[model samples]
Target: STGSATTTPIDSLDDAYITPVQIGTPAQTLNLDFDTGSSDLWVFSSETTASEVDGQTIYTPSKSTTAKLLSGATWSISYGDGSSSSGDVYTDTVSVGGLTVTGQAVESAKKVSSSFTEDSTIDGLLGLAFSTLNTVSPTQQKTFFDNAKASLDSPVFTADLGYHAPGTYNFGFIDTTAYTGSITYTAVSTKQGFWEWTSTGYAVGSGTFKSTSIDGIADTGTTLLYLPATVVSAYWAQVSGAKSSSSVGGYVFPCSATLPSFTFGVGSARIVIPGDYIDFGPISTGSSSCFGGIQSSAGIGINIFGDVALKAAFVVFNGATTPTLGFASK
Candidate 1:
């Protein structure tokens, strides 16, 4: 079987993308961010504290006859930005687009961070990373994709993230019309529970391609692209008024500065990120300085090819026994 869903960016800055998901028996639909960096399908629910609830939608398991508590099961996850959520587990019918997974583990949030409470756009997150990264305790559970792949025509999913536009996520089969040119395949390492792979090299603007290996994860959950300090510095140096400001916390340049395109290699294929995409946005409302979408991954431990990079091309998260990643121009 196969399925497809539209993913829309929540804000003008393309901060995050969300897709509608159906949960429980009667089906409570909620907009959820599909994160490829983590593995835990969690949601804001009736179990959450009333004080923690804002304008976001919540899933009420009590309203669904199919909801079954996974006794003794619990889950908690903390992100790099310090935001977190924790909850107990429930097994229910979960559906995305036309694809359905029966008895899928659905974590009902009991507590959430202030950041999550303030964001009314997304109700929760659906993790797509390997189940090895699931945070559930006592017994881990498979991701919705993991459980549904066996019945699918092919074990693969594709991410077609857009910039200030609507994109799509396709399961079970690849959509030929979503991309142009042939796909370039590369080996993926699931040891870290991420879609981690090695990029061949990169080039700044129209300059020469630097032949070096840069290992990173293709993370849809993160907003910016993070690379080695050396690569980030080289790219920023080409901009006239760019500087690394401690006060601003990253490389910022005059809003009017001419930004240069960034190109990275996937095997022999190169995907070019437009310059306008790199000029992320103003440092603040009405500010004359703009923050760069690409930053240094110095303390991040791993470089992240986030939306800033992924949006430049079509991405395939192939779930073969020995998984591999495929990239193609779009």
Candidate 2:
């Protein structure tokens, strides 16, 4: 069996992608962020603090006959951006697109951070990372993908993120028509509980490729691309009036400055991120200084190939016994 779903960006900047998910018996649909960086399929639910919820949708497990509480089970998760949520766990019927899984562990949020409360567009996160990263306690539960993988035609899923547009997520089979040229496959290390891989090297627009090995995770939950300071500095140097700003907390430049495209290697294949994608947007409304999409990962400790990088190509999360990642130009 296979399934397909449309993932739409939350905003014009493509801050996050949201896909509709069906939960419980009668199918309460909520838009959830399909996060590849973390594990735990959590949701804003009836158990959540009333004050913490804004205009976002909530899941009411009590209203579903098929929902069963996972007694003594609890979960809590914190993101790199400091946003966090914690709640009790329930096993219910969960469906994504046409795929359905029974007794899927669904985390019901009881408390949430201010950042999560402020974002009305996203209801919660549906973790796509390995099940080993699941935050449930007492008895860890497998992710929806893990439980459904055996029944799927193939143990794989694909992410096709778009820039200021809607993309797609496909399970069980790769959509060859969605990408161009041959796919370049690379080994993925699940030891870190992430889709971590090594990029061959990088190059500035119209520049020679630099040969080096860069280790990073392909994180769909993150908004920007984070690389080594040396690599980030090189990309910013090509743009006039660009400089790192402590006040803004990252590299910023004049909105009028011409930015250069960034290219990174996946094995022998090269994926080029358009210049416009790097010009994240103005630091503030009507501000002339624009923040960069590519930033330094020095403080982050690990490099992150986030939405900014992933949107430029097609990405596959192969869940075979020996997992691998596939990248292709779109």
Candidate 3:
């Protein structure tokens, strides 16, 4: 009853990492965005309106003998970036890599907002946040990792993200070979349904590591790092030509700017994010302009350590009892 699973990147857009997940008796496979910011395993299903289908691979539950409709159950979810999905529910066997959870709640989307519908390649999302964030009515549903934890060698998972390169998600076990040096551990407050934690301080480029506590959520679903607006402005001020562009939104700078590395503190451990990663990619194709991967967390209230920051280190989301985060250089 104890095992581990490894998830390889199926698709890599500048936005998020996608991986394949199998559901139901016949194993209908769909590439899902593994989001740690929310808690609902919703998919673009056969019930989705034809107009919303686009090129997404729809999950047809009826094709699998084990798929059972959860008659009155329903789910709805909205993301920070305005993407949303809503639909009915079903119980079926869901598998990731070699890990399987039977009778898992699978929310089948009947409606998808523009953000989701526009992405032709992403079929759905596999929420990795706490189950309390689940949008299913009447009863909340547990995430795949939550359900599989009981049978896992250890109730833990590690996200090894890379820049424009293949990454892996290890479930129920941590691969020591995947990271270097000692893993510095920090306490996590999951009351917010996120892997929320605080950074003691941070410094831009080679500047001294300023000592100031910053509360943030480690969200794999979000694409950029979001800090306070004032902090964001301060960082941009250091980079000449980097200015807040109402036209482009967020801060934009010359693509060839001499970007400096941004470093932050986790306990006493300092993790530095290379400046190149902070540049993200160009703001658009055929342009010499780029967007700062680090943005203002003005609306959200809490800072978010997204892929731009996460891919720079090996992250351990330890779930047993009080959750903790262990980070090490990759």
The lowest-lDDT stretch of 10 consecutive residues in candidate 2 is 76-85
- The TM-score-based order of candidates, best leading, equals 2, 1, 3
Q: What local lDDT score does residue 298 receive in model 2, on the 0 to 100 scale? A: 89
lDDT against true structure, model 2 = 0.94
Write one digit per residue (lDDT tens) for candidate 2, span 1-330.
898999999987898999999999899999999999998999999999999999999999999999999998999898888789999999999999899999999999999999999999899999999999999998998988899999999999999999989999999999989999998999999988999999999999999999899999999999999999999999999988999999999999999987889999999999999998888789999999999999999888899999999999999999999999999999
Error of 1 at 153 (Å): 0.8
Model 1, range 130-171, lDDT digits (tens) per residue? 999999998999999999999889999999999889999999
The per-model lDDT (C-alpha) reads 0.94, 0.94, 0.86
Error of 3 at 122 (Å): 0.7
Which regions of candidate 3 fall more than 4 Å away from where they truly are?
A: 1-13
Give the number of colliding residue pairs in candidate 3. 0
